[PDB]
Design a protein around this ligand. Structure first.
Ligand code: E4X
Ligand code: TTP
Ligand code: MG
Length: 656
């Protein structure tokens, strides 16, 4: 595959123009061969700027950087990231990167080139939609969106459905909070009828997701477990059953109050409620939620009572069957959100890393990028935290520009992003960083470096956001927020950061100028970009020693350098489903370093998530890998994560 990749890049170079401004002119002049219609594939404002600075821009680009991409990463770029004219790729990766850089920075050519170099050297990456759409007409640069139901009426349900349609069309994933919609059997005063509840409503969402493609629609549906239709909700993804009791193309998440977990643990009863009868449960959290909920129980405003454990069993069994629902702890998400001055946060997003406020007037937006953590390790096996912080500042300014540039699919999204200016900086290559540092994932050394990486990210992000506020003013809803009061994320976990960074001085800078962004950090999945860049995904442990059979480059390098490589090892790894643990020739220090996600404790995975979690103001797309699951294991895992203070206790459950 190494030679294959070079030939394919060489072929693309052969088959494309060299000069960036030339390619930009061809893209802009494009004429539809069917229509004879002039449909520019790049925006005029962007072309104007490129032609006006063509010598600097053209001569900045380093075409040899195209050879950096591995075989499958490059094919993925050819497949979806490089603009085509009549089915033939016109952009080199370098062209697309500069198109992106100018797309974000406009007149600021200094800025564009700095971004172009970071991106082309692979220090970080913008999100797929940004890479698709930057520098094009009506550019939709943001990844995903959150929304609440407008109202518990046919009017509201269908207006919200139209929003999802429009957003899906513009290539956004969606998280939707549905708990305010009344349940099965509940009275409808305007028709003198009774509601059929959530399921048939969700079947309309399900078919709308099948209908409207991203640029299939990906809608995660969020429900709080007090809702009367909670048991049916839990069946919607299952492969068995009647079509009318199924919504199999949606994704499912629970927005879990502390009270539920406490009542499961102490084996108490659990009241199911109808939201028309028991209003506002979704608009309070913590103690205020607890009081309200118990008050409705004392008022008899309850439709059904079950054992908390019977609903617990249903949740776990659904996860055993489908890997879902996702597990979010509502009170952890609200109690530790810088956005908590806005009101109660009703849901997360499609990938469970975004925690942002949504109302009938506001659709929250996820503005995302990831840092390639592997790049910050020196030949010395030391971590360049200073460089990591420096790159993080660049990314904050870039995402901040994206908020003002973005073409919003609905006006509610524009209003939310404009008022709160949240961003989500994540990571990839965490497992690679540890491997490069020679630290096993579970080691104490990895554990300290995990904290310190995320301390650095948060610090650098805050610093750039603060400089932005000094330059532009704080975001609109800043005063009255926890950070305006001197409360940073780790304080809300009661965590004292290491001595690596000077938080006292940063807090003084923030007390004086404030900050530009209500939120900053959010480790997202990185499924596409990690494969483009050749890193392990996001914060995940090592997936496998093999992925054409491509042995992991780091392992291959280490075994080659020791004299221990033999081409036979390939098939032994395959026979061991990606493991190197039972290969006798490989030394123990290497076996430890290259343990797979299936050989790594999930308890330590959750702990390490909680640990970094103190420095992540949003949440984290945290998958859980349990080869051989059972109810005790899942129970233990969820309760452990809940009690660690995790916002997102579980994204996907994976097994084998
Ligand atoms: C489910 C269980 C668990 C996951 C999280 C928190 C826990 C908290 C308390 C008790 C169990 C918990 C998990 N079981 S597991 O998936 O079979 C497994 C065990 C060891 C290794 Br190595 C890899 C996978 C586990 N990880 N570590 C540990 O001790 O258990
Ligand atoms: C009319 C109708 C409503 N519903 C649901 C949609 C909402 O969740 C809920 C109320 O719909 P609404 O459209 O609010 O009905 P309404 O205003 O006539 O009556 P009320 O004053 O009681 O609101 O009932 C159905 O599930 N099926 C139906 O055929
Ligand atoms: Mg009504």
């Amino acid at each position: 595959a190494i030679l294959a990749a070079r030939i394919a890049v060489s072929n693309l170079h052969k088959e494309t123009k060299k000069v960036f401004s030339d390619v930009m002119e061809d893209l802009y002049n494009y004429i539809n061969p069917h229509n004879g219609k002039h449909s520019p594939m790049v925006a005029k404002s962007t072309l104007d700027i490129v032609l006006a600075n063509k010598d600097r821009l053209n001569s900045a680009i380093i075409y040899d950087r195209d050879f950096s991409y591995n075989y499958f990463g490059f094919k993925t770029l050819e497949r979806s990231y490089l603009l085509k004219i009549n089915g033939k790729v016109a952009e080199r990766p370098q062209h697309m990167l500069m198109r992106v850089s100018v797309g974000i920075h406009k007149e600021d050519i200094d800025a564009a080139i700095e971004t172009y170099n970071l991106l082309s050297e692979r220090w970080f990456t913008h999100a797929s939609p940004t890479l698709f759409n930057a520098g094009t007409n009506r550019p939709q640069l943001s990844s995903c969106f959150l929304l609440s139901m407008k109202d518990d009426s046919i009017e509201g349900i269908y207006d919200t459905l139209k929003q999802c349609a429009l957003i899906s069309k513009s290539a956004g994933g969606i998280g939707v909070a549905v708990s305010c919609i009344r349940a099965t059997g509940s009275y409808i005063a305007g028709t003198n009828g009774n509601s059929n509840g959530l399921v048939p409503m969700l079947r309309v969402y399900n078919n709308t997701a099948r209908y409207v493609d991203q640029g299939p629609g990906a809608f995660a549906i969020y429900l709080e477990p007090w809702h009367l239709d909670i048991f049916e909700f839990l069946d919607l993804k299952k492969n068995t059953g009647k079509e009318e009791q199924r919504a199999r193309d949606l994704f499912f998440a629970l927005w879990i109050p502390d009270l539920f977990m406490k009542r499961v643990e102490t084996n108490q009863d659990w009241s199911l409620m109808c939201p028309n009868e028991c209003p506002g449960l979704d608009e309070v959290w913590g103690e205020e939620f607890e009081k309200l909920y118990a008050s409705y129980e004392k008022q008899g405003r309850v439709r059904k009572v079950v054992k908390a454990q019977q609903l617990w069993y249903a949740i776990i069994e659904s996860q055993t069957e489908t890997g879902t629902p996702y597990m979010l702890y509502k009170d952890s998400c609200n109690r530790k959100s810088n956005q908590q001055n806005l009101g109660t946060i009703k849901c997360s997003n499609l990938c469970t890393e975004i925690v942002e406020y949504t109302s009938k007037d506001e659709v929250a937006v996820c503005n995302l990028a990831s840092l390639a953590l592997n790049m910050y390790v020196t030949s010395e096996h030391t971590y360049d935290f200073k460089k990591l912080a420096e790159v993080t500042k660049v990314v904050v300014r870039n995402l901040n520009k994206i908020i003002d540039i973005n073409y919003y699919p609905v006006p509610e999204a524009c209003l939310s992003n404009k008022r709160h200016r949240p961003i989500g900086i994540g990571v990839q290559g965490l497992a690679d960083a540890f491997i490069l540092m020679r630290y096993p994932f579970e080691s104490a050394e990895a554990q300290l470096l995990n904290k310190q990486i995320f301390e650095t990210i948060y610090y650098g992000a805050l610093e750039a956001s603060c400089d932005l506020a000094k330059e532009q003013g704080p975001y609109e809803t800043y005063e009255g927020s926890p950070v305006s009061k001197g409360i940073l994320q780790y304080d809300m976990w009661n965590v004292t950061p290491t001595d690596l960074w000077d938080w006292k001085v940063l807090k003084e800078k923030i007390a004086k100028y404030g900050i530009r962004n209500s939120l900053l950090i959010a480790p997202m999945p990185t499924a596409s970009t990690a494969q483009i860049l050749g890193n392990n995904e996001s914060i995940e442990p090592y997936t496998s020693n093999i992925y054409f059979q491509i042995v992991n480059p780091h392992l291959l390098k280490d075994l080659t350098e020791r004299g221990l490589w033999h081409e036979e090892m390939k098939n032994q790894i395959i026979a061991c489903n990606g493991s190197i643990q039972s290969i006798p020739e490989i030394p123990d220090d290497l076996k430890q370093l290259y343990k797979t996600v299936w050989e790594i404790s999930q308890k330590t995975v959750l702990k390490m998530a909680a640990e970094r979690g103190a420095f992540i103001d949003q949440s984290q797309s945290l998958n859980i890998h349990i080869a051989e699951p059972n109810y005790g294991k899942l129970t233990s895992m969820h309760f452990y994560g809940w009690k660690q203070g995790l916002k997102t206790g579980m994204y996907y459950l994976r097994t084998r």
